[model samples]
Every structure is written in structure tokens, then in C-alpha cells.
Target chain A: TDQATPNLPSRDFDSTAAFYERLGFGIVFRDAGWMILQRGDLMLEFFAHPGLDPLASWFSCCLRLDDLAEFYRQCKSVGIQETSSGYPRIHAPELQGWGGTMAALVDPDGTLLRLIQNEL
Target chain B: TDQATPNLPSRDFDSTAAFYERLGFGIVFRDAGWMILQRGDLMLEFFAHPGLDPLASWFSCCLRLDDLAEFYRQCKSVGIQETSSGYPRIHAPELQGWGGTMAALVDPDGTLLRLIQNEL
Candidate 1:
């Protein structure tokens, strides 16, 4: 299941929005100082916060998908697995508001990746 | 300055490539099992690591820009600032391999943002 990760901070929402738009993402939703970008399965939420820390290199957000098995299979096809983390396992029942299969991974610089499959 | 953050971990490089392709990012460079996605100014490097953690919701990367002043101004226009961490200030002379203007920000979930302007 590839859930969406929303509410990411943007130093300059307008510029960042423009940047993402340049990347082919269109705004799907907006509220107050926040906006969501949707391009097919890739959903990104941008939030404008005053006086927040500048974007750092070691931060990331998680996403939830609809199908765990398909997502797992896709991950496998791309060769992303949980050999060191003990393989993709269900992480729900432990995480509040999350009641589906879950797995964790990292970006190049060790950014955490959490993929959850919602039961609904 | 946007120096670009390379070498990000992709649970599945091929699938992730397809996913990114769906987002309009094209392969700018590739070697072995790694590839670079370039869509305008957004450049992402995807690396395939065996048995890595699944993608998480709180991980992020950093990018250095070409002009710190312009980047800072753009950020200001979007209302993203360093009120808590102190306004954008030069971070070179302290960071190795970084010799230009630099600032830090955060994504929605506290992902760090580092923007640097190259002197050259």
C-alpha cells in the first residue's frame, strides 16, 4: 500500500510550489498555509511555517499505501527489502492510528522510510 | 548554489525509477545500480541497497543552491524563516567542503533543509 505523506515544511511555499510544479506535480488540495501536490501515486503536502528550521538533509516523512502485498512486491522488484531490519513485517497494533502492514527503510543518507498498508 | 543531494536510498531503484518517471523525472545519469532523476531543478539520486529499511515518513535530504541571498529571499516570500534557529546566517568556514553562503530549514515533519550557494 502506498499511502501519502503530507504536511512537509517548505521554506517558501510559493517557490517550492513552483519548484514542484516544475517537477510535474499539481496542487490537489490547499488550506490556509498548506497545499498538497499530487502526481499519480506520488503525493506531497507542503506547509508554510514561519520561523521554522531551514530544511535539513537528514529528515524524511512516511507514506501509506492501499495494498501491502503489491507494494511489497514492487519494493522487491526494485530490490528494496528488510534483510538487516528483519524483512518487511507488520508494524500496526504497535503504532497508534496505524492498523495495517508496515515496513521501514532508509534513503541514501539514512532518511527513514515507513510504508504502511491501510486495512480499509 | 543548489549543490544537489546525491546517493539517496531507493528501496527499489527500478520501481522507484518508474515511480519517479511517473512524476516526470528523467534519468540524468546512471552507473551500476544507481541513477539520478532530474526534473528541472529537482535532482534526486536513487541507490539500491540490499535489505535496507522500508521508506519511512520522517526522512529527508539537503540541497545546496547557487545563490544564498536569492534562496533566502524566496524562502522569506513563502514565510519560511529561522526565527527559532536564528535567521539565515552564513555557515561556511565551519563546515568542511562548504565554502559559500548556507542556511538550514525544516520540512513539515521537521526535515532539515540546507541551502548553499557555490562561490564559483
Candidate 2:
């Protein structure tokens, strides 16, 4: 009721894992329909089936980090960059009031992970 | 990137907090646009603005528990019942293969939290 792992939806397990790989997350456990991924102290679990697509998802979570601009730049290099032509979502980083310096990235399935660095 | 809290969205602070109250989570922190709630070790964070609405959100997470039936019963007791009307969305508990017996609840913003109990 108070704390629970964010069970993100994924359309394709392989592709989703690949995307996060760019973000430095590695596979912790993976089966046909279930997976756990981690990079440092962060972890995310996902479940998927034939027609699951979170592309239009309204659910989002925040990722707070100690490095802001460096992380933002990294997001760009990982093919998570914002395209000049827009309709599809992409990373948009800024200094927000929520936590501190922040940006966002979309999982292959469209789950948004808002990234924020430590307060300055 | 192994752990992070799910930062959900909210429209109204007090009302959203009230909805979870039925599920037994109590507020750990609150501000005009940010809040944290905890029940035992479970915690959820929220960030809101007047224009933000996660009603159509595609993001969903799973909540695993130790008691399936009891949790389901408790959810109903707190006014988290599924009305069974259809489109509006409501709690629908069942035995799922993923983790174990499961049911789901929608936070006021329509963010689905699929609840599952430990596997036997």
C-alpha cells in the first residue's frame, strides 16, 4: 500500500532491455514474460505479452541522480534523443521545482522515467 | 539504476491522499505540488499541477502482497471497490500466473496498481 516496485509494461522484452542498456542498466533476470533490470542501485521490473504497448501510458516515475548535464548528454547518445520532427516522445531535461535538475526518457513501450539530479 | 520510487501523478493532493487512505497508506510528507505516502515499507510519491491528469495514462505498476483474499477484502472495505459498470474502471481481483493471486486498484488519476500476493 505504501511501497511497491513499479511494474512497467513492455511490448518487446528484447528491445526494452536494449534501450535501457544504453542508459547503463543490465539484465538481472529475464524470462519470456518477466524481467528485472538494474544499473547501480536502480532497478525496474517488467512484464509483457503479445500485444502490450505502453506507448500511450499516463503513468510515469522519477529517477533522481547526482549528475544532471552529464546524464542528459548521455541520454542523447543512446538513441533516446529527441527527434527534430516530433509526435513521438523523447528526453526533455531541465531544472524543475519537483526535485532539481531533471530530464526524461521513454522506455521502448512508452513508460516515462523522469530523471532528476541531486538538489544544488 | 537498481532502485527508485515510483513518482506518480496527482491532480489534487488531499483527494488523492484520501483515496489511498482507504487502502491504509498514510502521508509521510506533503507540499503544494509534492507528497509522499507510506504504509509499512511501501511508499509512493506524487507531483501535481492543475493541468496534470493521468486518467488516460498508459503507465501501470504491480503491487505484490502477502495476503490475496484479505487484501482484496480490505480494498473493498476502503471504498476501493470495483463498481462493475465497465468503462469507468474498478477493482478486478483474480488468480494470475505472473506472481500469484492478484487484483488491481486505480489511484484517483487512473494509474493502475496491479496487486499480487506472494507465490505459493
Candidate 3:
């Protein structure tokens, strides 16, 4: 609530809400123009973009988490695919040379959510 | 910092750093491929994209702030023009019908940073 959240493009709010709900995101708000979803401390907002192409979308944001493994496990539990190409996919977390761990998730709308494990 | 931050694209790290530095952002880390910037509790990370078109970029994120007026004042103090239809533009904050105040900033790389006032 006190951080920079992502406001991505959603072609259909209902479908977008449903997709995220399965991943443990609770709907905070929803209307014809805007929607808000939250999972623990992470939040994502969306605006109506009926013409956005999921495959070609360039939208992205980063999620800096205190616990990456637990979140990744939850994501996997919900059936998010670990694949190289697709609308919804997740990459496994790997330690970066910069001293942080990172993973990636591509939403159905092609919004890339970079999952960064916070380093001390 | 236990939040979802924005990871945008920068055509050049130095240029991007310089632009944000003038607006009160301090560099947290910088390298050839990635950069991290911070302004108070707000954090932004960027990835290198030398071939990106600034005029056509679809990249964006939202900054949820408790003090919208203070941030807007700082932006104007840095001489960020309040203009329409261009890169590096700012639009003044206005009350949304949804009971929140929101402003807009378009960075040099065409990334839209929506400034939303946190509502209780």
C-alpha cells in the first residue's frame, strides 16, 4: 500500500480477475474501468485495455519479496506452468551474480512480473 | 522492501540515471545491464534496451504515494514540463471520480508512471 505497484493492461477484467484469483489474489476493487487485486502485501491494478495483444505486450513490473520460495511454491501449487513460451509461465528462481535471487512470471496479458528475493 | 516495484527499460543507464537524479532519485546500484534507483520508499529498477523506441514503448508502472502534493512539487521544481503529447511530460493531479487523486508522468523512454494517492 505504500509502494509502487503495477497498473497493467487488462483486455477483460473478469478473465484477468479469475486468472489471478486462482493464484491467491483477492479482489480489492473492480469496476468497468479499473480493478485491484492483492496477495498478501503485493498489489496489482489494471485498467481496461480491450485492444491489447497479450503476445506482444511490453508491460512489466518487479515484485521484491521477503520470501521467494514460499511464493514460488504457491504459484506452482496453483498450476502456473514453468515454460519458455506461453501466455502464463514462470521461470525458476536462480541466484544472480549481484547477490540476489530472481524469478519471472508472465501473466496471461503478457505482463512480466519479476520476482526478486530481497537481499540484506 | 516487501513491495512490488517497477522494472522499466532504459536506453542508456547513465542518461536514465542522470534524468532521475535531478528529480531526487539516488542510485542504489548500476551496471551495464541493470540499475536500481530510489526516492524515499519508492524504488525503480531498469533493464537495458538499446534498441527500444521511446515514442512507441508500452512499458509503464504506478507509484502509490501518501504525499502526492510533495512529489508533484518536487517534479515541477526540477523543470519537468507539464505538457501534452511528448516524452518526459507531467500532468497535474486531479481528483478521480473513484475518490482518489492521480497524476501522470511520462519518462524519456515513454514509460508511464501513474501517480496515485493512497486512499483509506
> Which numbered prediction scores highest in DockQ against the true structure?
3
Q: Which model scores highest in TM-score?
A: 3
Give every collision pair in model 3.
none
Clashes of each: 54, 16, 0
How do the residues A1-120 of candidate 1 rate in per-residue lDDT, one tens digit apiece?
212233355556666566456434688767667677765665665556554444243344444456555645655555544465532222221343333566654433233445555556
List DockQ for all candidates: 0.03, 0.38, 0.65
Name the weakest run of 10 consecutive residues (lDDT summed) in model 3 chain A. Answer: A1-10
Arrange candidates, best lDDT first.
3, 2, 1
Order of the predicted models by TM-score, top scorer first:
3, 2, 1
Q: Is candidate 2 or candidate 3 better by lDDT?
A: 3
TM-score of 1: 0.29
For model 2 chain A, the run of ten residues with the poorest summed lDDT: A83-92
- What ranking of all candidate models by DockQ puts the best one first? 3, 2, 1
Q: After superposing candidate 3, which stretches have Cα over 4 Å from the reference?
A: none
The total of clashing pairs for model 2 equals 16
